Amino acid sequence: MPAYACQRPTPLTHHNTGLSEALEILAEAAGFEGSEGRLLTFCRAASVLKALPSPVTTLSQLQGLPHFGEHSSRVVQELLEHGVCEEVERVRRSERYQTMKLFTQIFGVGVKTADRWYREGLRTLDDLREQPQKLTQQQKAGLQHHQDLSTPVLRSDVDALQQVVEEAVGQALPGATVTLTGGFRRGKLQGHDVDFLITHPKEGQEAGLLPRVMCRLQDQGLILYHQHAFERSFCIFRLPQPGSWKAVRVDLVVAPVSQFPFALLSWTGSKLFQRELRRFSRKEKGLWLNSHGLFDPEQKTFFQAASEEDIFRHLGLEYLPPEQRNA
DNA sequence: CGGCATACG
DNA sequence: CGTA
DNA sequence: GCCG
Numbered sequence: 001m002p003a004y005a006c007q008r009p010t011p012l013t014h015h016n017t018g019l020s021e022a023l024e025i026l027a028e029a030a031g032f033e034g035s036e037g038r039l040l041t042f043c044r045a046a047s048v049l050k051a052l053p054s055p056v057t058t059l060s061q062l063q064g065l066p067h068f069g070e071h072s073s074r075v076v077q078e079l080l081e082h083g084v085c086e087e088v089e090r091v092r093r094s095e096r097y098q099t100m101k102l103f104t105q106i107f108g109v110g111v112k113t114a115d116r117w118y119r120e121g122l123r124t125l126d127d128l129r130e131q132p133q134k135l136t137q138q139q140k141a142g143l144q145h146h147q148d149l150s151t152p153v154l155r156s157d158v159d160a161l162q163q164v165v166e167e168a169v170g171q172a173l174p175g176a177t178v179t180l181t182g183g184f185r186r187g188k189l190q191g192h193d194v195d196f197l198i199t200h201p202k203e204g205q206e207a208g209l210l211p212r213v214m215c216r217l218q219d220q221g222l223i224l225y226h227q228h229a230f231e232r233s234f235c236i237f238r239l240p241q242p243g244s245w246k247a248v249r250v251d252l253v254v255a256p257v258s259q260f261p262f263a264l265l266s267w268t269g270s271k272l273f274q275r276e277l278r279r280f281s282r283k284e285k286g287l288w289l290n291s292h293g294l295f296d297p298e299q300k301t302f303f304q305a306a307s308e309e310d311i312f313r314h315l316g317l318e319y320l321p322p323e324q325r326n327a
Numbered sequence: 328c329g330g331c332a333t334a335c336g
Numbered sequence: 337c338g339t340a
Numbered sequence: 341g342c343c344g
């Protein structure tokens with residue numbers, strides 16, 4: 001078992017679901033406390049279990065696995081012996097965890113804002129609604145739409161949305177393309193949002209595109225919220241339902257076609273997979289990876305990629321299709 | 328011990 | 337600060 | 341919290 005998540009296939013469904021979920025609770029709680037290192041270790045340990053070919057049934061099966069030390073092994077031990085880990089259950093029922101989870105789930109609220117509201121004594125969404133002077137416009141939208149945004153987006157919703165985005169994109173710039181990315185490209189059946197990547201086959205034609213797309217979507221009455229030169233938009237869309245509609249989060253990103261493989265890789269995820277890939281690139285290969293390219297700081301040169309396959313090959317990694325990037 | 332991904336709005 |  |  002290799003130490004980096006980008007070195008091994010990780011399928012969406014696997015054989016250690018309960019164990020990984022418990023470790024991910026501890027990872028999330030570490031993040032609420034501002035402990036990024038402990039969040040990463042618990043996330044990486046959970047992801048190792050997702051990559052295993054069969055269920056862990058005995059503690060000895062953790063020997064030699066990366067990211068399993070005394071703490072993560074003790075968590076697994078208690079789950080195997082008792083079906084429950086006392087530390088995990090203590091986190092689950094704690095007021096701090098439940099409130100931080102509730103607040104950070106709001107669009108426009110991160111850990112730092114949630115923590116400040118917690119320290120001020122706020123605990124519920126209605127507590128926030130009662131003091132709307134203290135909310136940004138983005139947070140007001142996140143709070144108004146919170147119920148709809150808490151409902152999973154279905155894969156059967158996604159095609160209809162892609163069609164309306166393609167219509168606006170085609171008027172904004174004929175020949176521009178829309179690619180589904182994010183969790184749905186990795187095979188998820190649900191999601192918290194829909195992520196799209198937009199480009200055009202002629203380099204440079206995509207400049208200035210996203211404002212033109214957003215104006216057209218807004219003119220069609222489909223935009224419940226957006227931030228408005230820009231190349232990423234984090235919106236709330238009106239999605240039709242039987243006799244009504246629901247609010248859905250939609251992310252749009254524009255990239256020049258020269259950068260498209262890097263952008264597709266970056267926005268397809270998973271989040272942990274991309275952090276691990278960027279860490280691998282820098283620490284093992286001495287190359288700097290982001291959503292725009294792959295930089296050799298010694299030569300001061302960028303690697304020209306025509307595909308995701310190119311990028312894996314340039315990093316010396318076996319290719320993983322999106323469905324195996326569910327770290 | 329240092330390090331923990333990276334950038335845009 | 338938020339967001340991906 | 342764990343790795344190198």
Ligand SMILES: O=c1ccn([C@@H]2O[C@H](COP(=O)(O)NP(=O)(O)OP(=O)(O)O)[C@@H](O)[C@H]2O)c(=O)[nH]1
Nearest residue numbers: 182183191192193266267268269270271274340
């Ligand atoms: O902090 C982040 C968040 C997101 N991303 C990249 O953006 C992609 C989309 O980010 P996302 O937040 O839409 N997550 P996703 O995997 O689609 O699952 P869901 O919760 O169902 O929407 C992720 O899969 C990562 O590739 C990052 O690189 N860093």
Ligand SMILES: [Mg+2]
Nearest residue numbers: 182183193195
């Ligand atoms: Mg998504």
Ligand SMILES: [Mg+2]
Nearest residue numbers: 193194195251
């Ligand atoms: Mg997204």
Ligand code: NA
Nearest residue numbers: 104106108109
């Ligand atoms: Na949030």
